[PDB]
Amino acid sequence: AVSASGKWLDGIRKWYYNAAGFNKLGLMRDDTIYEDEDVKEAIRRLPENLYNDRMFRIKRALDLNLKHQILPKEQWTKYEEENFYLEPYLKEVIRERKEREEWAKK
Amino acid sequence: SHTDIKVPDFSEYRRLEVLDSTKSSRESSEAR
Amino acid sequence: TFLRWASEPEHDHRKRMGLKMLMMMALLVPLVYTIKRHKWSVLKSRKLAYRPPK
Amino acid sequence: AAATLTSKLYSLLFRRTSTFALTIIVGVMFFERAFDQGADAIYDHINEGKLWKHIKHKYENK
Amino acid sequence: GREFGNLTRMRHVISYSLSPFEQRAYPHVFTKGIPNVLRRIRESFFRVVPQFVVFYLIYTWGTEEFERSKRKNPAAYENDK
Amino acid sequence: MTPMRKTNPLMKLINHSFIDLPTPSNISAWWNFGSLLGACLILQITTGLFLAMHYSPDASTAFSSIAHITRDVNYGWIIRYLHANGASMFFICLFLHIGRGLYYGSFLYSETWNIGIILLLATMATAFMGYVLPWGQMSFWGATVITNLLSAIPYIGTDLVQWIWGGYSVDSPTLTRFFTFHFILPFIIAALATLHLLFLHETGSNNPLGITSHSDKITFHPYYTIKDALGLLLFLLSLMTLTLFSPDLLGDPDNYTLANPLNTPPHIKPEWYFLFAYTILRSVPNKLGGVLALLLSILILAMIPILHMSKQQSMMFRPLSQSLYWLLAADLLILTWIGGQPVSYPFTIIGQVASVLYFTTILILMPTISLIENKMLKW
Ligand SMILES: COC1=C(OC)C(=O)C(C/C=C(\C)CC/C=C(\C)CC/C=C(\C)CC/C=C(\C)CC/C=C(\C)CC/C=C(/C)CC/C=C(/C)CC/C=C(\C)CC/C=C(/C)CCC=C(C)C)=C(C)C1=O
Ligand code: HEM
Ligand code: HEM
């Protein structure tokens, strides 16, 4: 595979990640996704610990935005430590919807 | 345990009259 | 000058009311902002903590 | 050691809301006169001679 | 879902607050307030300003070109003779 | 023993809408203009009602009536200026009220967003018929141009124009019906505004972050009352400064000369708030093309929710979309500026470029960059 292009792709993605300010508030990537019915069901399937963590980090972000403050540098989220915890659940829900729609047309 | 909880210091935000944890706040109440 | 009056005979009165408005705003705007800060202080100083079972 | 001015103003007036309203309206009565007179004097002092009330002297009482 | 009694389900969170009368209305508004505003301005300066600068350049040139057009043409009179 | 605001039917509504309304705590000033809009409406209504007690809606005495208001009616000049200046403030807040939704993604509330489009069109009509009431040179001719714009209809054309005019041209009958329509529509807008708030309450307000705010909701009575009471004070400060120091800044002369059907001023430019659309019209040589452009413009707002492709509401976390947004705003500023300038070579070409750039950015660039940002996030 392409090495220089892949490294350039990784570099620009990391640059874009730092440009987005949600890491400044301790938010993970999966917290910012718009909450449509599919996301609502996906959240309903989360285990209690991840659900509890998600709610608290959202509260902290809202609280910080309240006073126009920013979390300290050392506590910013890092590009390599992020875990896409919500990806498997959302994918399964979307696939189920596609199967239902495919059946419904015939 | 519920006893490990203790309120973090708000000294920075407190009024000058009630900064210290020694003098009663009752007298300053009317003024504040 | 006479023509400027004939097209605006409320000139002097308009500016007098403006003068009073300026001084009244100067007194009021800081006061109302102070009340806003007073009420909102409880939220701006709020501190949060997260203590899961472990 | 004297009790602060604000403390006295609170106990006698602000503690009871009815007196709090009474002092407000009396203050409005007084401040209205004071503010109006002060502002008018300032405006006139900015424009001596221009305002016609300062010109009446040159022609009055025939 | 529309009443404070039942909106969400949270757990294991604590909050601390002080009364309005026990704290200053302008705390650290000289040492901690101004720098935060400067952070806000700096963090979003290049995302907005430069575009509006282009607008100003387009506005100035335009006016200049418009007036430049009304100037008389010396090349339309050299031969008129 | 229980609170009396939870039993009386009239107090239940006030409690729901005003006192115990759950509202996000992190909403910024952008969420204040909503209230201000209603406040401004309430001002206009009262200001206009007092002007109606001395206005004669006739083509031969309307202009003289206004002159009499400003010279003989006690504090008539201030009332007239407050009405005129308060209309510009309405649009300023209205444009900023619409921009917030565009930026933060509030259009996802279909019902509320669509009701707003209707409210915008209703307010635009109210302001146009109000501006013709004074019966000045600009008023007379501005109505003529805008009313002759319906002749582009394929087969009906003239019929609508003559029907609206109540005759073969613009004259007293047109003035009278416009006066009545001006009077009534604002009250219709009030009913629409209640429907606007109705559909809103089912879901609630959207926070700047775009994440669900159900964990940080607070009551409205103690916090946003004072916060919205401070905004209204600033709104009044701006309005009173405009009225008491620069009464005629956002207006235009030639409205103080009697309307002449024969004479016509050269520039004849419309009001500032109806300038961006005016340039869009002039950019297309065809009449039918221009009118379609004007309409297609407003229609874009209805189509914007369908064009959304990103997996986030707010553009706060999408800087490329932010840059496009601000470029679009600058384009609107250029359109307004061009509308204020005469028809000439540089202005005409610039207007055409601005118009095409406007449409292309909304219809093409925004969806493409949104997908690109989804790619760099490994969505
Ligand atoms: C030259 O200068 C000028 C301009 O400039 C060019 C101007 O302009 C103007 C201005 C004037 C005009 C255009 C005239 C405008 C009209 C007027 C003055 C008339 C004023 C009065 C009114 C409209 C009031 C009449 C209507 C009334 C009371 C309507 C009441 C009905 C309702 C509430 C029902 C509607 C309800 C709701 C929420 C909104 C719609 C319905 C809904 C459920 C939501 C709809 C959407 C959906 C479910 C979403 C569907 C789904 C999804 C994803 C998207 C689907 C996408 C697909 C592609 C299928 C002037 C004068 C001018 O001189
Ligand atoms: C013309 C008179 C109008 C009035 C009186 C009015 C009134 C209001 C008020 C008071 C709010 C609450 C503000 C908030 O909670 O942020 C609001 C919200 C809203 N308005 Fe209007 N509005 C008007 C026009 C419009 C227009 C033209 C649009 C165009 C889209 C619009 C779209 C919206 C939307 C989407 C919201 C919800 C914002 C959110 O949920 O964050 N409104 N309106
Ligand atoms: C949103 C609501 C309204 C808007 C936007 C609006 C707008 C306007 C505008 C821009 C003008 C012309 C100002 C000028 O030429 O300087 C005007 C004139 C007028 N409007 Fe309205 N108006 C509204 C509501 C009302 C209402 C409810 C009445 C009820 C009587 C009213 C009565 C009048 C009158 C009498 C005039 C004549 C102005 C004059 O004689 O100078 N308006 N309006």
PDB file of N, CA, C and O and ligand atoms in Angstrom, chain F residues 110-111 114-115 118 121-122 124-125 128 146 192 195 199 274 277 294 306, ligand 1:
ATOM      1  N   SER F 110     -38.058  20.542  11.596  1.00  0.00           N
ATOM      2  CA  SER F 110     -38.819  20.804  10.380  1.00  0.00           C
ATOM      3  C   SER F 110     -39.985  21.744  10.652  1.00  0.00           C
ATOM      4  O   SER F 110     -40.076  22.832  10.074  1.00  0.00           O
ATOM      5  N   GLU F 111     -40.904  21.318  11.518  1.00  0.00           N
ATOM      6  CA  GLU F 111     -42.104  22.099  11.786  1.00  0.00           C
ATOM      7  C   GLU F 111     -41.770  23.553  12.096  1.00  0.00           C
ATOM      8  O   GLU F 111     -42.250  24.473  11.428  1.00  0.00           O
ATOM      9  N   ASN F 114     -40.196  25.504   9.121  1.00  0.00           N
ATOM     10  CA  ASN F 114     -41.112  25.862   8.043  1.00  0.00           C
ATOM     11  C   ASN F 114     -42.016  27.015   8.457  1.00  0.00           C
ATOM     12  O   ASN F 114     -42.289  27.915   7.654  1.00  0.00           O
ATOM     13  N   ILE F 115     -42.504  26.996   9.699  1.00  0.00           N
ATOM     14  CA  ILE F 115     -43.335  28.093  10.183  1.00  0.00           C
ATOM     15  C   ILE F 115     -42.580  29.409  10.073  1.00  0.00           C
ATOM     16  O   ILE F 115     -43.162  30.454   9.757  1.00  0.00           O
ATOM     17  N   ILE F 118     -42.723  31.034   6.596  1.00  0.00           N
ATOM     18  CA  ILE F 118     -43.983  31.749   6.429  1.00  0.00           C
ATOM     19  C   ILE F 118     -43.938  33.084   7.162  1.00  0.00           C
ATOM     20  O   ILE F 118     -44.352  34.119   6.627  1.00  0.00           O
ATOM     21  N   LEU F 121     -41.976  35.674   5.167  1.00  0.00           N
ATOM     22  CA  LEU F 121     -42.682  36.218   4.014  1.00  0.00           C
ATOM     23  C   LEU F 121     -43.778  37.181   4.452  1.00  0.00           C
ATOM     24  O   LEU F 121     -43.996  38.219   3.816  1.00  0.00           O
ATOM     25  N   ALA F 122     -44.482  36.852   5.537  1.00  0.00           N
ATOM     26  CA  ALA F 122     -45.526  37.738   6.039  1.00  0.00           C
ATOM     27  C   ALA F 122     -44.945  39.073   6.486  1.00  0.00           C
ATOM     28  O   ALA F 122     -45.518  40.133   6.209  1.00  0.00           O
ATOM     29  N   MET F 124     -42.129  40.431   5.449  1.00  0.00           N
ATOM     30  CA  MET F 124     -41.641  41.144   4.273  1.00  0.00           C
ATOM     31  C   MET F 124     -42.770  41.908   3.594  1.00  0.00           C
ATOM     32  O   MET F 124     -42.593  43.059   3.180  1.00  0.00           O
ATOM     33  N   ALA F 125     -43.939  41.279   3.466  1.00  0.00           N
ATOM     34  CA  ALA F 125     -45.090  41.963   2.886  1.00  0.00           C
ATOM     35  C   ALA F 125     -45.512  43.153   3.734  1.00  0.00           C
ATOM     36  O   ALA F 125     -45.821  44.226   3.203  1.00  0.00           O
ATOM     37  N   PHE F 128     -43.219  46.158   3.150  1.00  0.00           N
ATOM     38  CA  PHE F 128     -43.311  46.776   1.831  1.00  0.00           C
ATOM     39  C   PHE F 128     -44.529  47.680   1.726  1.00  0.00           C
ATOM     40  O   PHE F 128     -44.445  48.783   1.176  1.00  0.00           O
ATOM     41  N   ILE F 146     -42.247  47.135  -8.189  1.00  0.00           N
ATOM     42  CA  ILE F 146     -42.469  45.821  -7.598  1.00  0.00           C
ATOM     43  C   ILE F 146     -43.807  45.245  -8.037  1.00  0.00           C
ATOM     44  O   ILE F 146     -43.946  44.024  -8.173  1.00  0.00           O
ATOM     45  N   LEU F 192     -49.363  33.438  13.841  1.00  0.00           N
ATOM     46  CA  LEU F 192     -48.338  32.540  13.322  1.00  0.00           C
ATOM     47  C   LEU F 192     -47.218  32.346  14.334  1.00  0.00           C
ATOM     48  O   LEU F 192     -46.672  31.244  14.466  1.00  0.00           O
ATOM     49  N   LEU F 195     -48.119  29.696  16.767  1.00  0.00           N
ATOM     50  CA  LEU F 195     -47.903  28.381  16.174  1.00  0.00           C
ATOM     51  C   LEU F 195     -46.421  28.053  16.124  1.00  0.00           C
ATOM     52  O   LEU F 195     -46.020  26.903  16.337  1.00  0.00           O
ATOM     53  N   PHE F 199     -45.104  24.413  18.084  1.00  0.00           N
ATOM     54  CA  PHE F 199     -44.335  23.266  17.607  1.00  0.00           C
ATOM     55  C   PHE F 199     -42.958  23.196  18.253  1.00  0.00           C
ATOM     56  O   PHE F 199     -42.379  22.109  18.359  1.00  0.00           O
ATOM     57  N   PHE F 274     -34.443  45.149   1.458  1.00  0.00           N
ATOM     58  CA  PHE F 274     -34.886  44.506   0.225  1.00  0.00           C
ATOM     59  C   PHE F 274     -33.917  44.821  -0.907  1.00  0.00           C
ATOM     60  O   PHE F 274     -34.342  45.182  -2.008  1.00  0.00           O
ATOM     61  N   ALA F 277     -32.069  40.749  -2.756  1.00  0.00           N
ATOM     62  CA  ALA F 277     -32.941  40.183  -3.777  1.00  0.00           C
ATOM     63  C   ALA F 277     -33.025  41.087  -4.998  1.00  0.00           C
ATOM     64  O   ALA F 277     -33.138  40.598  -6.127  1.00  0.00           O
ATOM     65  N   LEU F 294     -35.656  35.291  -7.537  1.00  0.00           N
ATOM     66  CA  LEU F 294     -36.146  35.779  -6.250  1.00  0.00           C
ATOM     67  C   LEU F 294     -36.843  34.675  -5.469  1.00  0.00           C
ATOM     68  O   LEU F 294     -36.541  34.441  -4.295  1.00  0.00           O
ATOM     69  N   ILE F 306     -32.866  19.465   3.545  1.00  0.00           N
ATOM     70  CA  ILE F 306     -32.681  18.289   2.703  1.00  0.00           C
ATOM     71  C   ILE F 306     -31.239  18.182   2.225  1.00  0.00           C
ATOM     72  O   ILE F 306     -30.753  17.080   1.949  1.00  0.00           O
TER      73      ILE F 306
HETATM   74  C1  LIG G   1     -39.294  43.181  -4.355  1.00  0.00           C
HETATM   75  O1  LIG G   1     -39.034  42.990  -2.984  1.00  0.00           O
HETATM   76  C2  LIG G   1     -39.961  42.187  -2.279  1.00  0.00           C
HETATM   77  C3  LIG G   1     -39.647  40.732  -1.903  1.00  0.00           C
HETATM   78  O2  LIG G   1     -38.411  40.136  -2.248  1.00  0.00           O
HETATM   79  C4  LIG G   1     -38.312  39.702  -3.593  1.00  0.00           C
HETATM   80  C5  LIG G   1     -40.680  39.904  -1.139  1.00  0.00           C
HETATM   81  O3  LIG G   1     -40.427  38.785  -0.838  1.00  0.00           O
HETATM   82  C6  LIG G   1     -42.017  40.527  -0.755  1.00  0.00           C
HETATM   83  C7  LIG G   1     -43.049  39.715   0.066  1.00  0.00           C
HETATM   84  C8  LIG G   1     -44.333  38.884  -0.184  1.00  0.00           C
HETATM   85  C9  LIG G   1     -44.276  37.610  -0.618  1.00  0.00           C
HETATM   86  C10 LIG G   1     -43.984  36.160  -1.080  1.00  0.00           C
HETATM   87  C11 LIG G   1     -45.837  37.408  -0.372  1.00  0.00           C
HETATM   88  C12 LIG G   1     -45.898  36.334   0.807  1.00  0.00           C
HETATM   89  C13 LIG G   1     -47.288  36.044   1.447  1.00  0.00           C
HETATM   90  C14 LIG G   1     -47.873  37.049   2.157  1.00  0.00           C
HETATM   91  C15 LIG G   1     -48.134  38.430   2.827  1.00  0.00           C
HETATM   92  C16 LIG G   1     -49.141  36.330   2.812  1.00  0.00           C
HETATM   93  C17 LIG G   1     -49.032  36.425   4.421  1.00  0.00           C
HETATM   94  C18 LIG G   1     -49.838  35.333   5.199  1.00  0.00           C
HETATM   95  C19 LIG G   1     -49.435  34.040   5.145  1.00  0.00           C
HETATM   96  C20 LIG G   1     -48.709  32.712   4.769  1.00  0.00           C
HETATM   97  C21 LIG G   1     -50.515  33.331   6.088  1.00  0.00           C
HETATM   98  C22 LIG G   1     -51.389  32.274   5.289  1.00  0.00           C
HETATM   99  C23 LIG G   1     -51.114  30.852   5.902  1.00  0.00           C
HETATM  100  C24 LIG G   1     -51.536  30.554   7.158  1.00  0.00           C
HETATM  101  C25 LIG G   1     -52.191  30.715   8.567  1.00  0.00           C
HETATM  102  C26 LIG G   1     -50.975  29.053   7.314  1.00  0.00           C
HETATM  103  C27 LIG G   1     -51.305  28.182   8.612  1.00  0.00           C
HETATM  104  C28 LIG G   1     -50.918  26.678   8.456  1.00  0.00           C
HETATM  105  C29 LIG G   1     -50.078  26.170   9.393  1.00  0.00           C
HETATM  106  C30 LIG G   1     -49.255  26.047  10.702  1.00  0.00           C
HETATM  107  C31 LIG G   1     -49.783  24.668   8.958  1.00  0.00           C
HETATM  108  C32 LIG G   1     -48.246  24.426   8.618  1.00  0.00           C
HETATM  109  C33 LIG G   1     -47.529  23.713   9.829  1.00  0.00           C
HETATM  110  C34 LIG G   1     -46.256  23.343  10.128  1.00  0.00           C
HETATM  111  C35 LIG G   1     -45.104  22.765  10.980  1.00  0.00           C
HETATM  112  C36 LIG G   1     -45.282  23.713   8.879  1.00  0.00           C
HETATM  113  C37 LIG G   1     -45.642  22.910   7.535  1.00  0.00           C
HETATM  114  C38 LIG G   1     -46.109  21.509   8.035  1.00  0.00           C
HETATM  115  C39 LIG G   1     -45.627  20.435   8.716  1.00  0.00           C
HETATM  116  C40 LIG G   1     -45.637  19.058   9.460  1.00  0.00           C
HETATM  117  C41 LIG G   1     -44.032  20.357   8.589  1.00  0.00           C
HETATM  118  C42 LIG G   1     -43.716  20.202   7.052  1.00  0.00           C
HETATM  119  C43 LIG G   1     -42.353  19.446   6.854  1.00  0.00           C
HETATM  120  C44 LIG G   1     -42.318  18.146   7.236  1.00  0.00           C
HETATM  121  C45 LIG G   1     -42.787  16.820   7.889  1.00  0.00           C
HETATM  122  C46 LIG G   1     -40.882  17.527   6.838  1.00  0.00           C
HETATM  123  C47 LIG G   1     -40.998  16.393   5.702  1.00  0.00           C
HETATM  124  C48 LIG G   1     -39.685  15.541   5.732  1.00  0.00           C
HETATM  125  C49 LIG G   1     -38.342  15.390   5.614  1.00  0.00           C
HETATM  126  C50 LIG G   1     -36.891  14.825   5.737  1.00  0.00           C
HETATM  127  C51 LIG G   1     -37.904  16.288   4.379  1.00  0.00           C
HETATM  128  C52 LIG G   1     -38.688  15.724   3.118  1.00  0.00           C
HETATM  129  C53 LIG G   1     -38.001  16.136   1.787  1.00  0.00           C
HETATM  130  C54 LIG G   1     -38.437  15.760   0.564  1.00  0.00           C
HETATM  131  C55 LIG G   1     -37.657  16.242  -0.681  1.00  0.00           C
HETATM  132  C56 LIG G   1     -39.652  14.817   0.396  1.00  0.00           C
HETATM  133  C57 LIG G   1     -42.339  41.967  -1.126  1.00  0.00           C
HETATM  134  C58 LIG G   1     -43.697  42.563  -0.726  1.00  0.00           C
HETATM  135  C59 LIG G   1     -41.305  42.796  -1.881  1.00  0.00           C
HETATM  136  O4  LIG G   1     -41.554  43.915  -2.177  1.00  0.00           O
END
